[PDB]
Structures are given as C-alpha cells and as structure tokens.
Amino acid sequence: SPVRVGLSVDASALGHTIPPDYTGLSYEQAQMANPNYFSGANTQLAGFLRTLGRQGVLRIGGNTSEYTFWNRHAKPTAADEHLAAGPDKGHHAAAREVITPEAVNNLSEFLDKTGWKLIYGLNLGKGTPENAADEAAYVMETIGADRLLAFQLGNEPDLFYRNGIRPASYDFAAYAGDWQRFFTAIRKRVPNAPFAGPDTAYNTKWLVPFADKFKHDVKFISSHYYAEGPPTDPSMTIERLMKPNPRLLGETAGLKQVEADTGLPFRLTETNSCYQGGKQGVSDTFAAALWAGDLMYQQAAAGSTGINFHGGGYGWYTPVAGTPEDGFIARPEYYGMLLFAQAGAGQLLGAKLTDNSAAPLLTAYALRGTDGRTRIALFNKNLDADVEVAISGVASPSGTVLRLEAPRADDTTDVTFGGAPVGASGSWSPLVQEYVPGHSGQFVLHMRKASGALLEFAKLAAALQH
Ligand SMILES: O=C(O)[C@H]1O[C@@H](Oc2ccc([N+](=O)[O-])cc2[N+](=O)[O-])[C@H](F)[C@@H](O)[C@@H]1O
Ligand SMILES: O=C(O)[C@H]1O[C@@H](Oc2ccc([N+](=O)[O-])cc2[N+](=O)[O-])[C@H](F)[C@@H](O)[C@@H]1O
Ligand SMILES: O=[N+]([O-])c1ccc(O)c([N+](=O)[O-])c1
Ligand SMILES: *[C@H]1O[C@H](C(=O)O)[C@@H](O)[C@H](O)[C@H]1F
C-alpha cells in the first residue's frame, strides 16, 4: 500500500526565480584539443543541448584546464581530430594539450547553433598571465561579448595544495595573489573581460573571502559539488545517492551565505553524482536521473542561479555520451535534466510535504511558469516505497502528468520520460500523458517507488483561448 503524503502548495509564498539559462553542462578544457567536437558541424550534440534548454550555459574547465595551453601560432594540425575527452579521472596530472585558434572559432559556431552562453576556463595552474591574456582576447573577439558569460581563473584552486599544482602550503591567501596577477594581465588586453570564481571543489571558506576580495571584478560566485566518491568505495551506492549528506548541506549553506552576505549570484559550475569520473552501476543508472533533476530544483530553491553537470566522452556520469564519428545518445541522467527542461522557467512557490516520514526521500517543487501555468516536479527517490500524494493549493481544473521512469532503479537503459525515449540529436515528444482531474485545488497522484513526475496544470476557464 502506498505511503499517503500531503503536498500543500502555497501560491502566495514566492521563492526564487528560475532563469531561462539555469540549465547547463560542464566539459574538460582538453575537449578543445579536438575542433570537431564543439563545432557547427556537430549537429547531433547541439540538438541534445537545445532539448535541455532554449537557453543554458556551456562551461569549459575542469582538471584538464591546468594542462591545456592556448597557442595562437599553432599549426591547425596540432589538433587531435578524434579526441572525445571524458571527465578527468583525477588520479594524476592530465596529458598536456594545446588549444588552436580553429578550436575557438568552432566553439563560437557551436554556441550559435545551440543558443547557449559560455563559461571559459583559463590556465592559472600552469600557464603564464600573458598567455591567459592572449587567449582571453581571442575568445572575446571570436565568441563575442553577448555570449561570453565569464572567464574563470583555474579550476578547483582549493585542491592545488594537495595535487601538486602548488606546494603543500598554498592557501586562500596565495590563490588571491595568483588571481589578481592573472586578472590584471587579462584586463589590460581585454577591458570588458567578465569573470567568475573561485570555481572551488568543496572549500566553502574560500567563498565569502573570494567574493569580498574581488567584489568589483566578478559577475558571480562559483563552486562545485559531487554527491559521492571515490568510485572504488563500496559505500557509494544508488541508495546513498537518493539521500542528503553533510557535503551537500555545507555547499547549500555556503551558497546561501555568499548570496546573503554579498548580494552576488551563485552558480554550481561543476557537478555530478560521483567524483573521479563516476561510478559504474550508480552514475550510469536511472537513479542518476532522479538525483540530477532533484538537485536542479533543490539548488534553485536555495538560491542558485544555475548549474553545469560535468560530462563528456562516454563517462559514467555523462548526461550526453558519444563522438562526432559514432553519434551521440542521451544517457539516463539526461532524462532528469529533460524533466526540468520540460517544466521550464518561472518562479518557485511554497510547497510543503507532510505525513512523509515513511517516504522521507520524496521531494516536490511547485513553480509558476513564465506562461502562468503551475507545474509541480516530484521525485520519489524512495527506492522501496510507492506514494500517494494528496496535493492541495493548486488553482486549476485539471493537469497532465508526464512520468520519469525505468523498470528498476539501477537500469542503464529503458529510461523514458512522458512515455518516450530521447532519440537522435535530442529529439523528444511526450507519447504518454495522463489526465488528472482536480476539485477545489485538490489532486491525487500515485507514484511508483524510484520514479519521477512532472505535473502541468491547465489555466482556469481558458478552453477558448487563441
Ligand atoms: O604529476 C602527477 O602525475 C601528479 O598528479 C597529481 O594529480 C593531479 C594533478 C593536478 C590536477 N589538477 O590540476 O586538477 C589534478 C590531479 N588529480 O586530481 O589527480 C597527483 F596527486 C600526484 O600524486 C602526481 O604526482
Ligand atoms: O607545463 C608546461 O608545458 C609549461 O608550459 C608553459 O606554458 C605554456 C605552454 C605552451 C604554450 N603555448 O603552446 O603557446 C604557452 C604557454 N604559456 O605561455 O602559458 C609554462 F609557462 C611552464 O611553466 C610549464 O612548465
Ligand atoms: O492529459 N492530457 O494529455 C491533457 C492534455 C491537454 C490538457 O489541457 C489537459 N488538461 O486539461 O490538464 C490534459
Ligand atoms: C571536477 O571533478 C570531476 C570529477 O572528479 O569527476 C573531474 O572530471 C573534473 O576534471 C574536475 F574539474
């Protein structure tokens, strides 16, 4: 028998706004070594991005951003024509790669085909300030001011002290030294160069200090988040992924603090289910779809202005997998992002769960969409309990439900949303839609264990609208 829970929506309790560019992805800077990947001719990948959002952000950085060197005078053939750069596995220094001018040109075409904006990593770990300045100049010229959201100076500088990029004594102080030096060189060459940071791995203590020290220099504050790791650790399981944890609590507190204290927006610029490249049998499963869609909403509710799920290649946690030669496919995690895409932008509303102690991992978010229609995204992350949700507070005669499903939580395939898989180049239309009738704002929705749902409610009295 289902666990019977209440969801009270309060349309008068307004929360944060979800902007049209909330969604996004993160990729390794090393991907720039192959100009055919982010390219106008890569119509398949662009299609997958357009389905994730009419607007969104592509972030390029990661562990490889310390090992990639802009070379304005490269032979075009320096390029690795075949490279599909998967998430860095974080065991040792990445292979050193050059970025060519044509890679930047093709990145511009790709952004033009997708309608997305760009966050671009610069090499503060091993590069010089002069080369960063030159790189920045070419990117700004090529990408354009309209599409370049920010440069970022180093990736996860809070781990430099332990990974060898710096000595064991490197700390916030020294980073702020490094950052200032690069910033000044870049701005001399590119007066309108925009910035974000500190792009930290986990260390929230760097956030307010960074935001305070560089308040007039940056557009937003950034940090990262991984639910689990390392992948070889047997405690890192699907069930664990469905649950909050102290790191998430700390990141969430960290983002609220920086926004409260400084008034600067926050963006989660690198995130996925398990670090060091993800975990087989967890990161590549239907559970990751529930995990990722729920994370997008939880972060927005806390005040995050956007997100970037890391990926690339055929990485265990990649939302999109593939290569320009063999084609691209949506992995299970993509479908959690797709639910969010389908819900769209708007303003979050009060929505409280009650009688839910026997179904503690169910989450729900109500949104007043741009078009004025109410949506509710639910994630029954309970692996073993079906739920029956008594929804109230919804001023609508009826809704449709689109289901996020797979036959088992650990399935690496068989994932559908709205009764359909995603096809080639991000193609997707709902094929199964269930009507839910309401009265006095009350609706009842059953959800199987380990499933999700998006409810879209009809306007009142709008049957004759043009
Ligand atoms: O030189 C090595 O192989 C060195 O690699 C360290 O690993 C890293 C170095 C740099 C980065 N990074 O810029 O992101 C990341 C890693 N990493 O996450 O593995 C090793 F820690 C060190 O033992 C090794 O000597
Ligand atoms: O790690 C290294 O290879 C070495 O690289 C230098 O930085 C560069 C390498 C290559 C180019 N380029 O192909 O135009 C440019 C730079 N650069 O001016 O940043 C570092 F300076 C050096 O410390 C590092 O050991
Ligand atoms: O269940 N449906 O496919 C469906 C379609 C259009 C609709 O307008 C509604 N509705 O009124 O909520 C439901
Ligand atoms: C963010 O963390 C990722 C991971 O550990 O999976 C890496 O792939 C990425 O290079 C790093 F920036």
TrEMBL record:
Organism: Acidobacterium capsulatum (strain ATCC 51196 / DSM 11244 / BCRC 80197 / JCM 7670 / NBRC 15755 / NCIMB 13165 / 161)
PANTHER family (alphabetical): BETA-GLUCURONIDASE (PTHR36183), BETA-GLUCURONIDASE C-TERMINAL DOMAIN-CONTAINING PROTEIN (PTHR36183:SF2)
One GO cellular component, as annotated: membrane
Sequence positions that bind beta-D-glucuronate: 28, 63, 88, 155-156, 270, 276-277, 317
Molecular function (Gene Ontology), one example: hydrolase activity, acting on glycosyl bonds
InterPro entries (UniProt xref): GH, GH79_Enzymes, GlcAase_C, Glyco_hydro_79, Glyco_hydro_b
Protein name (database record): Beta-glucuronidase C-terminal domain-containing protein
Ranges for domain Beta-glucuronidase C-terminal: 364-454
